[PDB]
Design a protein around this ligand. Structure first.
Ligand SMILES: CCc1c[nH]c2ncc(-c3c(C(=O)O)c(C)nn3C)cc12
Length: 167
């Protein structure tokens, strides 16, 4: 039993809810919240900008030190950093950004990072300002992640479309 509430069950291990991932993280304080990161961990907008703002920019300060030491992530890669006031840990995962021409096949590699964590609160990778089709992102998630994932979808219209079209 865990503390996640109000989710629709899609499969044995995937759950989905119309929610703001920031407010959901604040309320549950999950072990892991996933950030929709870019390779530079520049958390300017989208999910990343919202998560970072909620940490009062502490996520960005930590991230800048990480990049200065380690260099950029790979598209499809991830790193574990602090969850600050939102979670124990933040798993920063880089899905391909279609608006940069990145290969959508890398979306499966991105979701494979979730399998290193037993339970996660997450957005749909490569959705929103990353330009991919969220219906496709949900399909890759379900077909790749084997651990227990709780997906937060900000847009109510999109959430209803994702549920109604789910095979
Ligand atoms: C609609 C207003 C809004 C405020 N904050 C948001 N955060 C994320 C998304 C969003 C998501 C998500 O993860 O829910 C996905 C997937 N695509 N898009 C575009 C939308 C908003």
């Amino acid at each position: 039993v865990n503390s996640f509430s109000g989710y629709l069950k899609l499969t044995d291990n995937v759950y989905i809810k119309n929610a703001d991932i920031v407010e959901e993280a604040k309320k549950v304080k999950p072990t892991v919240v996933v950030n929709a990161a870019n390779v530079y961990l520049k958390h300017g907008g989208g999910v990343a900008g919202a998560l970072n703002k909620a940490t009062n920019n502490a996520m960005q300060v930590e991230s800048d030190d990480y990049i200065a030491t380690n260099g950029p992530l790979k598209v499809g890669g991830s790193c574990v950093l602090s969850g600050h006031n939102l979670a124990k840990h933040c798993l920063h995962v880089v899905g391909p950004n279609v608006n940069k021409g990145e290969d959508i096949q890398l979306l499966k590699s991105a979701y494979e990072n979730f399998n290193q964590h037993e339970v996660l609160l997450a957005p749909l990778l490569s959705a929103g300002i990353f330009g991919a089709d969220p219906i496709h992102s949900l399909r890759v998630c379900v077909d790749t992640v084997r651990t227990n994932v709780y997906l937060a979808v900000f847009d109510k219209n999109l959430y209803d479309k994702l549920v109604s079209s789910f095979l």
